[PDB]
Design a protein around this ligand. Structure first.
Ligand SMILES: [Mg+2]
Ligand SMILES: [Mg+2]
Ligand SMILES: [Mg+2]
Ligand SMILES: [Mg+2]
Ligand SMILES: [Mg+2]
Ligand SMILES: [Mg+2]
Ligand SMILES: [Mg+2]
Ligand SMILES: [Mg+2]
Ligand SMILES: [Mg+2]
Ligand SMILES: [Mg+2]
Ligand SMILES: [Mg+2]
Ligand SMILES: [Mg+2]
Ligand SMILES: [Mg+2]
Ligand SMILES: [Mg+2]
Ligand SMILES: [Mg+2]
Ligand SMILES: [Mg+2]
Ligand SMILES: [Mg+2]
Ligand SMILES: [Mg+2]
Lengths: 116, 60, 131
RNA sequence: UCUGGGUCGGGGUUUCGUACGUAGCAGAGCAGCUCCCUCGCUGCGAUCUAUUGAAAGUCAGCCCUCGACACAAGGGUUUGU
RNA sequence: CAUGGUAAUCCUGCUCAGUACGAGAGGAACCGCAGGUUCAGACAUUUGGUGUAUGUGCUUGGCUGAGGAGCCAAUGGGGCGA
RNA sequence: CAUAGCGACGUCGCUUUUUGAUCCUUCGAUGUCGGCUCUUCCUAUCAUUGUGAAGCAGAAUUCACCAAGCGUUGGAUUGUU
RNA sequence: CGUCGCUACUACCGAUUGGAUGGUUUAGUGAGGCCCUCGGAUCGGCCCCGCCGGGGUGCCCUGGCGGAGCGCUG
RNA sequence: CGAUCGCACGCCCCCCGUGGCGGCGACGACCCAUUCGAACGUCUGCCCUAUCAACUUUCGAUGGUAGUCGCCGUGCCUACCAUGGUGACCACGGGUGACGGGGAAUCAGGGUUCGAUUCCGGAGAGGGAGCCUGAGAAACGGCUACCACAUCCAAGGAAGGCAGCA
RNA sequence: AACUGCGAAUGGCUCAUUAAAUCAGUUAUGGUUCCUUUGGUCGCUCGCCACUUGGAUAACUGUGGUAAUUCUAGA
């Protein structure tokens, strides 16, 4: 139930098994048995040994779209308010665009008359 | 162990302190951006699948 | 408190180990181990955390033809650590101290065994890392 | 005995490390074949890859079989208050 | 069970306690705790050693026409090894 | 301050781990130093257990008693003891 | 004038396979950075096209959940 | 081959009347030229030393050809060739208590010493080495690694560079 | 406050290294680069958003980890 370690071979090391190596440069390795340890000590690459986990993942041995959009009330307007504004599709927006045109045109014409 | 649970669609994140390792071993040995059904937390967390997004070490 | 458990010694009298401090000494030649009552024909041997008497063989000439107290910090012999792990290091090493335990040097190169670290708090502070 | 213990076989465990053969437009290249092809095909070639954590061993002092086969109420020598 | 043999040993650290004692410098002990030394009797879960399981790869010289499969070199050598 | 601890001038002993003295055994031969190995024994006790005394405040030490259960080491030089 | 005797000081030789500090290098190991060949933990677009849908009129303009095309790709 | 930001604010109205037009700028740009420069080159010039007379050439030393690389020209590097190249007119090697110069001291003339030091050029940031960014750095009041010193720590880690002013 | 742009490669200090090296005068780059300033050039090209397109991230709200640092993560 202690820390679970992994070897030169990448295998799982249970407590009371294997040995631990502490190099002078400060790195600590752990080995499952003398086979995995001596392979490490002979400067042998684990990716070239067919029973090593690192080899099997390199050679691949034995081996979606999510999108959700939500509407949230913001500071100042509730979800009820923003729903009403976006649900003015049946000619309510048309009334807004035509009242904007006539008001802006009548203000523009009156501004030209204000100067003389 | 503390858990920083957050709901994206409502905000309102909160921090929950637990100490039962049986409830957290369903999270153990899982990578980030993975979803694990968090039904092991009591009885109220049923129907919930939660995604690991980050964390901190003992030293921060 | 807590006392040191028994460990495999591995370093008898006559062993030459590295000198991991910066005193200018390069190696330490172990001549005896402190606290060893002994037995007929048995060489006094030392593990990590053991205090020894040592003479440096190569290094500064002001340290050479003298007897120095030293403490082993690393050993190449595997030793069981009461929880299954059989730890061993890349080399044997030790540092020069005095009888009180203060280190003559001011820095340690490489790791220091946990057995030596919590037995000599003066050494542990100077240790770069604990293995 | 409500059988027995053997011998093979099987399964497990474990050791080593990926078998022979076949296939590849893999392969330093080389030697041949061009009405030919419009970039081609025929050999030799260590090694590589897939088949293949494969192949091989594993009680003789490993574990479990209830699969198959035969054999086991046989032999000899003695022993009395 | 008559009888015979016979076995355990010593030390350190913490605490007591910078305490008693002492002008000061210095400086204990009993109980308790954690460990060692030497010795003794075992044991192989683990680590290490061995290793001709002649177990399985690698490899030199030669030999079976070649491949495959092997063998010989007083254990050919070497790696890992139940 | 004779006797905590020493003991002059003298005097009484013990031991056979020294070396002498002698020549009883062995000259038709008892293999003659040291080391290594291994067992046991003695106590005239270095340490440990229990104690007594001091010029024993503590620490350290010294003297003495019961006491041989247990231990008494690794090395440089030297054939060496 | 030189030897010898005393006292100061200065160098020289000298066993010590003497010692120490610079510099330039052979060989061995070798951190780290850069380049190259891979690698692809993740994050996305398109193909959505199980559906409620639809408009010039099942022939979808699509208003969203969600299946997920189990592919083409950044 | 401008999807950028301000300032006053105006003209045309026939097609009408809602659009098209407008100046002063700022910012931005591939390229060109200039400016500040930078980088590598040409010629001449340096102290003591021969108790340094022959050096260089494996591993480039000298040249040729073809390239690679760099911002470019060049053995800068690679391959294939030729055996060259420098020296008593002092090479090469060693020392320097040597950063170089403009300059300073002494002063008949000629000369002899000193220039670390405010101007110019170079170099360096404890010693080496390697890079990110940027037009420009092999930068250190940037980073990475090692070496040496050194800092805090709950010992799991983290952080250094006064030959800048004090 | 933060994103963006610019500077931080100048200045200041020191003289260790360095003996055709640095450096001084002279000359070349017809063998190169050059932010910025300055002046050119920017309708020279036939080719269902343009009355203005796409997504994220800071600062900010909130939940934190560590003993610690000008450390930062998740939403
Ligand atoms: Mg002996
Ligand atoms: Mg079987
Ligand atoms: Mg008895
Ligand atoms: Mg052969
Ligand atoms: Mg064969
Ligand atoms: Mg034969
Ligand atoms: Mg072996
Ligand atoms: Mg006689
Ligand atoms: Mg007589
Ligand atoms: Mg005889
Ligand atoms: Mg005899
Ligand atoms: Mg007695
Ligand atoms: Mg100098
Ligand atoms: Mg000067
Ligand atoms: Mg200057
Ligand atoms: Mg510089
Ligand atoms: Mg710039
Ligand atoms: Mg630098």
């Amino acid at each position: 139930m202690k820390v679970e370690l992994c070897s030169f071979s990448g295998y799982k090391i249970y407590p009371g098994h294997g040995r631990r190596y502490a190099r002078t440069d400060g790195k600590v390795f752990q080995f499952l048995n003398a086979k995995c340890e001596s392979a490490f000590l002979s400067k042998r690459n684990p990716r070239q040994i067919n029973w090593t986990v690192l080899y099997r993942r390199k050679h691949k041995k034995g081996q979606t779209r999510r999108a959700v959009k939500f509407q949230r009330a913001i500071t100042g307007a509730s979800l009820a308010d923003i729903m009403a504004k976006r649900n003015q599709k049946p000619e309510v927006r048309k009334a807004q665009r035509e009242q904007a045109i006539r008001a802006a045109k009548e203000a523009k014409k009156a501004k030209q008359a204000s100067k003389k | 162990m503390k858990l920083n649970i957050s709901f994206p669609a409502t905000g309102c994140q909160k921090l929950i302190e637990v100490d039962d390792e049986r409830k957290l071993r369903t999270f153990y040995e899982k990578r980030m951006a993975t979803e694990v059904a968090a039904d092991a937390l009591g009885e109220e967390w049923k129907g919930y699948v939660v995604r690991i997004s980050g964390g901190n070490d003992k030293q921060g | 408190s807590g006392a040191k458990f028994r460990i495999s010694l591995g370093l008898p009298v006559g062993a030459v180990i590295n000198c991991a401090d910066n005193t200018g000494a390069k190696n330490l030649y172990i001549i005896s181990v402190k606290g060893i009552k002994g037995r007929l024909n048995r060489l006094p041997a030392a593990g990590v955390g053991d205090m020894v008497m040592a003479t440096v063989k190569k290094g500064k000439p002001e340290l050479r033809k003298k007897v120095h107290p030293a403490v082993v910090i690393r050993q190449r012999k595997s030793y069981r650590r009461k929880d299954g792990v059989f730890l061993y290091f890349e080399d044997n090493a030790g540092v020069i101290v005095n009888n009180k335990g203060e280190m003559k040097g001011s820095a340690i190169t490489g790791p220091v065994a946990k057995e030596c670290a919590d037995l000599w708090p003066r050494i542990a502070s100077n240790a770069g890392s604990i293995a």
